[PDB]
RNA sequence: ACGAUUAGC
RNA sequence: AUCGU
């Protein structure tokens, strides 16, 4: 059904639409936090061994 | 109004129905061309006022370009496999030549070129003004396809 | 209380393996058993849905981590 | 047990025990027909109640003051009620009524309003006018029930005598406490017992077709007749919906507090957002699970094309991010002596942290526990309170921004710095697109729109005939035929041959009044305009229809829940997309000739 | 810095897209419809069906093959962009095999 | 203001408030609301704000996309972004801005930001409706003046309305049914002699019944269609047990009936008062004060006055006269009472006479009519019901669920409330506004007051089915007032086209019951009711290519049974028609040639 | 093989409803 | 969920309804391909979250192998002589490449 | 009892139903 | 009856009905071979002894 | 001389 | 809203 039936808005511009939809996501920045946990996980396994 | 006051031509409100009531069809079929056209081409005699406005627009083509309305074109794109879209194409093809729009012929070509894409394809100039654009969006004199 | 009442009703309405089968194990009215069989068929059809088979409302101890 | 003895087969018939036939139904109907109210109250007394059904009753419901100190006579020789709490204390006082009763014949223990006071008010006495106004208003308040309440009470008793019912699908009996746990019904019995006293009659009042009779007793007040209906409603809802006892007890406490106050209707209007604001407005402070519909409604918007795509689990981050509703709720609970109920509701609400069925049912019970009665007040007071407020315009349109008058209309120049320019532009484009659009000239359309307001219903024809005869123009009259002479069809028949020039005088006529009550809301006054006055306002409604049909996203929905935009609410209430409720207070007096009509008439 | 896709990606040189049939998904749909039509037209299968039902099936297949769906175009030239945007910031980085 | 509760309190009052009860009030209110919200969102908003995030929010939403207004109230939708839901502080600041903006031109917006939605007194939380029970009182009724209450049949109608309101609000179904039956019995008797309504009349009014003829208790749901369809549904559900019960006790007849067999259903139904109740339920429940004697030539000048008022433009009168001319030429009384513009004055006169107090003689006539109907004996049912009973159905497999069983869609419906929960889960709620969907079915959008669009469309469809020349439809449309060219075109369109089941159903007086309108009935009417039997063509359920409108009637005949039974809605297959499709169509046509 | 049952019904113990015939009861 | 929130494409099954309502077929036939496919093409449990999840499964093929459920296939083999099974085969063949 | 299917008629004797 | 206890061959007599339901034929015809064959076979349950 | 007067949808 | 008083 999804393949057979799907349409775009009647009047859209792709770059404007994506620039609207992407901005909120980028500000959140929880990507940075994980890296820190990965570092401490590696340090923990090495100090364990 | 001045045209309507003195013009001998008039309504004859029964020709369309009389020439469709005698079409031989089968009641078993679901689709019926006569009942489709009689519902797609409803007369209300505001049609004559619109016709006289279009006819009087001939005198002023330097200030007025009597283009055809967008609602007449099929919503989204038509399909030749659709009886309603085919009758809409017929109505558009008959109506277009009476306008003063310089780009009437290209719109007349594209109103049919649009509704049968994939089924039947022709080359285009660019990928922005492709084969599946709205036929009314060809108003500029040099948007006419090279094909 | 209403919480356990709802839980009991849901369990009663809903609740009713890999091994080869063995020999050991016209005028239709409306009847309670006749309604029950349709209810069982309906609930089995719902339960055999691939998304429902894995859908959960609360995360476990490791998905949250 | 007398209910069982006199109704044995009927309960077994309607409880799924035995077959349901016609003879049992007719015998039970005859027994219902011949059943005295005192017998109903005796059967009520036979109920072996339990604890958890008993809530203390204040002693101050019975002992109430008189009515003289609540009304007065102002200038212009008008009767109205003086206010003690703001400008909304214009409802029925909770004062006693006993001293206004004269015993009716054929039965000593009941009476009605005395004809002596009625005559003394008719010929011009002040205190008599106050007394008769109070008596008639109390009569109107007591006359807000479909049928005698004892019939509903007895029907509930008969229905609930059957006990628990088996469920064919769930394959078990339904666990709902019996009548021994019905708090409102026990309160009803206690109130009736205390009012009746030594007198053999037990009904506090009897409801006839036109007028009701009051059982005179020193403990009788004017707050009883709405209280009884309220308790019966609560008991029926508890029995037929499985309401938990605690919420119903809180509702009964609120009702008794309202009765013990100065005015029942005023108090219940002041406290009408206790349950919806403590429960509905404060759940899901911390979520851990649940399912919500993943609605998505398509880009074609004016057609309301909604699509449903499964259900998605609730994340923890979809909690209640709205500002807390604690301060005003606590302040309101402290102001009206309802702190315990508010505290109980707030403490109970926080215990639901998952969006399962139970939380929704608790919300439904809480919203059901509010008191639903038809508030009533004197028409001369709703007229004086609703039609005297005027809008407060802080930045009006500057005087220099207008032009000369086109008759009685001044066009607003588009060079204005005021915000009305955009409204004028929108209405101007709407009017132009109407006028050019051609269906507004077919004679059938005009006939339909001219026959829209011609309805078999009153339209203030007396004022029409008075105003039209003020210019010595005579209209035909019809006598001897049984048609109503106070309807708009009569006006249309009277205004057939007359041209517009003669009937244009009646446009400025004085409209008559109208009134209708409403549940938990002040009654609304309605002014029906005569037939030419409906006629003269056709372009306004037509261009408004054009605006609402093409320019904006709106609906003109119907009266019942079935004919309504339910999907839109389901979409707007989903957790990912929160919504805002915008309401306009007193929109009737909002638009006037200063700003809105002044712009709109010129634009049209 | 590389993410794989089961379907091929052809970027779009325009920002105002509109319906066109040049891509693998539409080709697949059209070929399935044509194969069904050829199966219906098989000499061992056509006599088993009535005259009108064959025409109805042919028309249904033609309309299904000529339907106006933008999902193939999206999957070709907009889905990879969104996937590549979302992929970096994600509590579990993509773990893929060829 | 000339009230009655306070003597000597008549006066006049000048007010500046816009009139309520006028034609234009709600429309202009909604229009102004939308326009002011739009201008706020466009020009006033950004001119009085400082924060960047609130400006970003305000530039994102417009009234054409997310704002719905009806009159006084309104609702605004804020959609979620990729990073969850919009921050609350920005919304609070924007609401403060709205409050500041509204007071400039004399408006006080009552704005609530609570995480829920309110619109037209409907409450939703997390995509789940919540019925406000207290807003619909059970014993309450509003009365402004001191007029006396209407007679007993009016309170019967009020009790039926109470039951329907309880249905819509989602109560405990078993207990609510029992209490509704209790009230039914309580209010069923009134003296004058005594008058009683046999239970079966109340069943015909739409109240479901618990356990009869020794069947299983609690077997019928309240989704029962009201009216004739409803009787057919439950009778066809329980027929093979009804015949057994009848035969088991003294009801045997040598004659064999195609519906009931060798059971004397006539004598049994007459003794059970089922015919008496069924026929009495159809009698009017208000005094027939309409038609009261009037001196002549006075009613005549009255009707002439309304006729002159209605038709001031000569051309419309010419259209009506033409329509009558070709109606006499072609109609020839094929349909008994074709609607026309000349009969509008008569209907207006009847309606104006109706709104009046009825004398004692009118009530006496009403009671005499009820007594005569009760005392009489009836040989058989109505033609429509007998035609319906000729159709047999079969129920093989239940539908697959259309809604997840763990998703709360509405309050009150849950596993504790088995019937509504299973019905909604199996069928599904209606995700489209009923108003537009019902509007798209009508041939003519609106007509003059005093006439019914349903009546006009029913007359048009009867003139199609009963064979009639196209000219008859043109004459009818001219009599309605349509222009000659448009009438001809519309008649030509109507002659050959096919229409959905609802309109065809109207041909025999069938409409979707108000109870079903909360569920997604259209998909069931289209797909999950199959006219072809599960084992191929039976050569007996052969609908001719003429009278192809029978399919809609069969669709409701099946759907009533599919929806009446408790539990999961089940796919239903047509099984047999006794007399044959052409015979049943002939029965419908010979009923159409009536009324 | 169609065996309808008539007369001499009684009550059920699981649910106290009264049935038409003993075979319907069981 | 992130894909559904970011993507401009939205699923609308009314296109299929219109393009199948515009089909030409006779009433006297005992089975109709248009009605058959329209009835078949309604997903069980009315959920459409099996497409965005299918797209999201591209990122993880090392651990997750998204396969078509058993119930999608016909209950007992099939038969090209049966239109319902033929439509089921169409659905399966058009959905497998994702 | 024994009941006919096409028309609901209960015949007491097991043999006359045929 | 002894062989019945051993044989794993179970009948679902609805096979013929299911395979005969989807047979293309016009309603206007008056012979209906599918109905004829179904009425001739009369699929029962005890017709296996 | 007084009296059973009302919206729109 | 005059025959009800
Ligand atoms: Zn039992
Ligand atoms: Zn027989």
PDB file of N, CA and C in Angstrom, chain F residues 135 317 412 441:
ATOM      1  N   UNK F 135     -22.887  16.433  31.782  1.00  0.00           N
ATOM      2  CA  UNK F 135     -23.476  17.415  30.880  1.00  0.00           C
ATOM      3  C   UNK F 135     -24.795  16.933  30.286  1.00  0.00           C
ATOM      4  N   UNK F 317     -42.107  30.995 -11.387  1.00  0.00           N
ATOM      5  CA  UNK F 317     -43.474  30.509 -11.528  1.00  0.00           C
ATOM      6  C   UNK F 317     -43.685  29.856 -12.887  1.00  0.00           C
ATOM      7  N   UNK F 412     -15.126   4.515  29.017  1.00  0.00           N
ATOM      8  CA  UNK F 412     -16.318   3.727  29.251  1.00  0.00           C
ATOM      9  C   UNK F 412     -16.339   2.410  28.505  1.00  0.00           C
ATOM     10  N   UNK F 441     -23.691  12.467  -0.922  1.00  0.00           N
ATOM     11  CA  UNK F 441     -24.629  11.504  -1.487  1.00  0.00           C
ATOM     12  C   UNK F 441     -25.812  12.194  -2.155  1.00  0.00           C
TER      13      UNK F 441
END
